Structure 1
Amino acid sequence: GIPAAFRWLSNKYPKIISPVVEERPIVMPDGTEIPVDATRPNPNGEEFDNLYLDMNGIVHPCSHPEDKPAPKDEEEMMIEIFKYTDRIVKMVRPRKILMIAVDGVAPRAKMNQQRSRRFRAAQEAKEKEEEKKKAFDSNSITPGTPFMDILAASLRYWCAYKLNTDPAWAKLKVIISDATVPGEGEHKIMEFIRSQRSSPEHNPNTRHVIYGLDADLIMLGLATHEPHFRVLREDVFFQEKPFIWLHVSILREYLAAELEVPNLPFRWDLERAIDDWVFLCFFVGNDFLPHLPALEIRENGIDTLTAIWKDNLPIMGGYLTKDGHVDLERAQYILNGLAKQEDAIFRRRREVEERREAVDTVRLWEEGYADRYYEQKFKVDPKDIEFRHKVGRAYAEGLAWVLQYYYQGCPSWEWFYPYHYAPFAADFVDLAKMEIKFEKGRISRPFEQLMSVLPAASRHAIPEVYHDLMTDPNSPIIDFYPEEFEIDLNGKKMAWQGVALLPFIEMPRLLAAMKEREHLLSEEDRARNEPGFDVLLISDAHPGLYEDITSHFYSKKQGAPKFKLNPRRSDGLAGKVEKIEGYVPHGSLVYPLARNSMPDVDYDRSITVRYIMPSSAHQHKSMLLRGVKLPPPALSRSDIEIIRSKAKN
């Protein structure tokens, strides 16, 4: 999540946005809506092969809508989720692949972010009920909760149902990675794209679409280096219910003109430049690192960085980034160049705030702000300078972590930046002497992840055997679950902005307390605490791939219960599939919810198998694959010269 990053990019680079042409259903005089024929050519001018759904962006608006009355129970929420997701698929009309990615158990660095936004939701709910002196807890949208089990069963039904009914899903391969499969929803998509890209049969001109509002999807869309890539998102700025595209192909054109440097001692490569730009944007903040005090998106902090990056690029000897790895020796140039401007940036910020008028105790525009900053925000010794360097090394370690996470997959499931504030650029010293080594670490179980991201007010979603650890004042880990906590606005104006001063979980303590109680879990709960897997769903009308899996798995002359996919028989899908035990195909598709508001299908035309992404030793390369054909340029010489003339300022 990068707040204000979208409002910034769309203002600076306007041509990356275009409206989504959505065909609407015809409504009968009797009221019956006639569904949209999604087999007809896509009215957006192009045909999209793959559509990836960051699914939690659909679950949140349909469960706690801010604009309409909230649904009456979970079943009506699933119905809205069906209607919303169907509307999206009727818009994109994917022709080959459709991935449903629900947030699974995430790395420790993301869990601390999830812990923050979930602790705040509990306090907002308490403060909005004390002002009124059981609703749906938004924190149920968390991996491993009872709510996610309802959602998993509902998406399995709805996909099989659409494979049966909608004639535009015949050749469509549906991949469902539910909340029992570890991995952040954005990065389960990102890892699937990397796996297909490394396939020898892969189409270099695949048209990708990813859905979600998380600004991380823009960065990841750039990190794939698949040119034919769009981001589908709701027109959040609709004040004066539609959707908009964000053309990563066009954003690449804007970054081409924004970053091009004449006369370099080394070869200029737009692909390697985009990587450095993505790396540079980590400094303005995201889910894993705080923004540096000098860098704010609303202050053109990205422009400050790209300026310093262009000034140092000839003398660096090369780029900052190569395929997800950082040359910290070169990154030293960037931070040295920002430290020289920190003093002046804070002053320019105060001069703006003084003209906006015509309490702050740090006073970044006054001499000695660094001693006040660590004294009041980090709440440490201002005289301890080595501590400041440590925070710098911690932040630099985090930059290397996020870059590998985005480009090659999570390098450490246990690492996390252990401070609530960022250091100054002046505090990054001797970065060339760092030797960063990441251990993959231990992935959390669903219940452990729950205890790591939920507050005590949401313990309903947690097995009762653990509740005493969150509420008993004599609990050995009660210091992890405060009922009240301070939120530092840090100069910002709104309450959703700012830092939540929550203690960081010492994970060995939490795991030790949960192990002492695990033998009391029910047999159904022990099974819920185990990792699931991805599944592929196709219809019996999918050419080749359906005939293949019925032969290997469900014929009379069955062979191995797992075989690799040939991308010529499947519609370009690479990887292995495994037979699901206890599953007989073509039975009766039964609607899982109680009120039977969706039909049972007596003969299920769909078939479900376990899907296994390909895993190659060849890393994800930041390059244009052989055989790619770039889209015709969207920017004009007028466009380019405007971006260049402004970039010189």
Structure 2
Amino acid sequence: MGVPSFFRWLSRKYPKIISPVLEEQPLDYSASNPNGELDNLYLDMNGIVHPCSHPENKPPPETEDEMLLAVFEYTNRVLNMARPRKVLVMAVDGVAPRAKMNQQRARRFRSARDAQIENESNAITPGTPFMDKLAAALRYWTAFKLATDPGWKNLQVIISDATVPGEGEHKIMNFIRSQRADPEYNPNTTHCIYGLDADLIFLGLATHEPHFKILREDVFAQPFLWLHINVLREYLSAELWVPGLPFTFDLERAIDDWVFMCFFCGNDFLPHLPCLDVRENSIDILLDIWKVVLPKLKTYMTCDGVLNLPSVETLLQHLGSREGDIFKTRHIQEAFDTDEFVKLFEPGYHERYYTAKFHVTPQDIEQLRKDMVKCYIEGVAWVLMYYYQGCASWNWFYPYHYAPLATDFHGFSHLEIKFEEGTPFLPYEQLMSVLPAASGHALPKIFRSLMSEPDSEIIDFYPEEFPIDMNGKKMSWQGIALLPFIDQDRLLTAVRAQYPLLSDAERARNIRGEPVLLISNKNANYERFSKKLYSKENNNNNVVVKFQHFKSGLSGIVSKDVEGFELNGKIVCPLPNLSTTLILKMSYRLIPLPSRNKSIILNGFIPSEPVLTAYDLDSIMYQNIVPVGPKGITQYKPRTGGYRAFFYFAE
């Protein structure tokens, strides 16, 4: 898509966050130009698999081999720009939670609807032969680099293929958070994310690691940009200020509340409130409400990923008081398909909007409203939990195509909220959930019969054409597919019945295959790891190594590969690698969190230099290249009343 107005909002409010990527004219290890060096790098890998499989530039690659070649070319440019010195994480996208699947399914069905017009990219989901071919290929390309480039002789690489469940963006947060939980973790490791998504800004803040940078292509002006989280926290220190609070001000909690408002007023799982059309012209309205309400509360609204429902009701009540005028002002500013909503809002609001959307009688609406508001608030809780402490449930989802009105959010404050971590779906169950029948060639075609054959128990989940619903005068691609929500018990019992008919080679790639992988090349750990894991006492790998951040800038738990790798073996591209004298690789696991993650700055964090000045902050109370990494040794600012400060303050 073309350059979103969201970046225009960012550049209008926060211009000093952006800086160009400094770039050169092939030796890896030489000091990089962009005012710092990176310890760690994280890849949103779908954010290159998609641009490869369906470019905005005219020529597509002609074959899977050429698509993979294009992926290797592009990743080589990315690493040569960023130069990670200690670790790299591949994070391929995987099996998603139900709340994600039932949103993705609609986009997936709409693509097959568009393919009928094109006859006159759905292979990129987990479990397909294409992603399996990528999972062989990307590992090989990494092994080749570690074996042949000496600049990487200290580097560690972490690989999390499509067989590993969880959304890639969530795999990354779990990695960051489990490293951050190690007592030996260096408080000042520099971090970077590559990825196309706007949400990454909020997730950077949600780590509370202030040394983050985000790497992106600007759609206008092939240049690249850094966005510095380090500078955004500096901006928010002015923007989030409120005088006279009864509880003490605290920047981490204010930032968590602001991140919560951003996920609330525009979301990847829930439908948007009709009042709150798009983030970039909406966040500032809720922020003004928060700045008005905050001094009446007992506390900040969020806490380590948990809500305070009593407080949130007061904001939503204030928004309800504005909701009518927000509808008026939207209409004043204007000066098969189902999209007709000419009744607007002013006659009766919810009393007539509800029957227009849901086809429900006016006597039933109180019950429907009460149930929808419960479900939407549970969704807002599940979303906040998802990013702050991982998914509460893989089984949970929002039951409806539409959101309540702002007037409707009250009486939920009495609630207490609960969840279970019930196991996510297998690869073919994931595919059966999201694929339209046209794309059914991607499954073992035994399953494809259940999508298409008129005898199938589950045909209701595979409509060949479906009702679609455009809103807000969006005369564009943006229509909501009103598909029936899947009964997972009906689907899973229909799908699992086919399993004993499948080949052992088709049970492969439908087993979970849960291990993440780690690769090394005469690294600081090499002999220790080799000595236990491959010259093991047992042929059966019961032997496992735990390891800690201090020695090599990474921590985890480590064990032999399941893949038939061996210490003296060598291997071939799907340009032989000679691993037998060059590499060791292992199954890998995160150290599980000792206790719930805290939104705090860790002990021993040193700030970078400040970038803003009094003229910037006083404008908010109404650029160039920039440094990265710690500004020297001292953990505390110079201040009046102190020995080392006295000579400094006296120049």
TM-score above 0.5: yes
**2:211 is equivalent to residue 228 of structure 1:** yes
- Which residue is equivalent to 1:301? 282
Match for 1:632 among 609, 621, 642?
609
C-alpha contact (below 8 Å) 1:170/1:538 kept by paired residues: no
Match of 1:600 among 564, 576, 589: 576
1:396 aligns with 2:377: yes
Report if aligned partners of 1:576, 1:613 keep a CA contact under 8 Å in 2.
yes
Alignment check: 8 A CA contact 2:253 2:302 kept: yes
Distance across 1 between alignment mates of 2:209 and 2:98: 29
Mapped partners of 2:181, 2:37: distance in 1: 23
2:551 is aligned with 1:561: no
Match of 2:556 among 563, 575, 595: 575
Task: Give CA deviations for 1:410-432 in whole Å, capped at 9, x if unaligned.
Answer: 01001011212111111112121
Name the counterpart of 2:352: 372
Q: Deviations over 1:381-436 (max 9, x none)?
A: 34412211211111110010011100000010010112121111111121211121
Query: 2:79 is matched by which residue type in structure 1?
Result: V
Equivalent residue, structure 2, for 1:149: 132
Instruction: Identify the range of structure 1 (400-409 vs 65-74) with the bigger mean alpha-carbon deviation.
Output: 65-74
- Name the CA distance, whole Å, in 2 between partners of 1:172 and 1:373: 58
Answer yes or no: is the 8 Å Cα contact 2:536–2:543 preserved in 1.
no
* 8 Å CA contact 1:20, 1:244 repeated in 2: yes
Identity %, equivalent residues = 57
Q: How does 1:15-414 map to 2 (within 5 A)?
A: 15-24=16-25, 36-130=26-120, 138-238=121-221, 241-297=222-278, 300-353=281-334, 355=335, 360-383=340-363, 384-414=365-395
Structure 2: distance between partners of 1:261 and 1:61: 43
Name the stretch that deviates more: 298-307 or 509-518.
298-307
> Would you say the 8 A contact 1:201–1:572 is kept in 2?
no
1:425 aligns with 2:406: yes
User: Does residue 469 of structure 2 align to residue 478 of structure 1?
Assistant: no
Q: Deviations over 1:343-402 (max 9, x none)?
A: 01000111101x2xxx85254342213233222223333441221121111111001001
Provide the aligned C-alpha RMSD in A.
1.9
8 Å CA contact 2:17–2:231 kept in 1: the answer is: yes
Deviations, residues 271-321 of structure 1 (Å, cap 9, x unaligned)? 001111111112222211121111123672101111111111111111111
Gap change, CA 1:222 and 1:494, over 3 Å in 2: farther
Query: Aligned partners of 2:182, 2:111: CA distance in 1, in Å?
Result: 42
Structure 1: 4+ residue segments shifted above 4 A: 1-4, 556-560
Give 1:265 shift.
Answer: 0.3
Q: Report the CA distance between 1:219 and its aligned residue.
A: 1.3
SS at the partner of 2:260? helix
Confirm or deny: 8 A CA contact 1:225 1:623 kept in the other structure: yes
- Inter-partner Cα distance in structure 1 for 2:34 and 2:19: 10
Q: Say which of 564, 569, 572 aligns to 1:587.
A: 569
1 CA distance for matches of 2:389 and 2:426? 23
TM-score normalised over the length of structure 2: 0.91
Assess, with a 3 A threshold, how the Cα gap between structure 1 residues 298 and 449 changes in structure 2: closer, same or farther: closer
| Cα 1:531–1:560 shift into 2, 3 Å | closer
Which moved further from structure 2: 212-221 or 98-107? Answer: 212-221
| Matched letter for residue 269 of structure 2 | F
Give ranges in structure 1 of 5+ residues lacking alignment: 25-35, 131-137, 593-598
1:540 aligns with 2:521: yes
SS of structure 2 residue aligned to 1:23: coil
Aligned pair in 2 of structure 1 residues 343, 449: CA closer, same or farther (>3 Å)?
Answer: same
Counterpart CA distance in 2 for 1:489 and 1:261 is: 40
Cα distance in 1 for residues equivalent to 2:376 and 2:7 = 24
SS at match of 1:72: coil
Contiguous gaps of at least 5 residues in structure 2: 623-651
Match of 1:30 in 2: none
- CA distance in structure 2 between the aligned counterparts of 1:379 and 1:255, rounded to whole angstroms: 44
Render the CA deviation track for 1:193-235: whole Å, top value 9, x for unaligned.
0000011011111111011111221111110000000111111
Mapped contact 1:536–1:611 kept (Cα < 8 A): yes
Deviations 1:229-260 (A, max 9, x none): 0111111233xx11111111111122222111
Q: In the alignment, is the contact (CA less than 8 A) between 1:107 and 1:414 conserved in 2?
A: yes
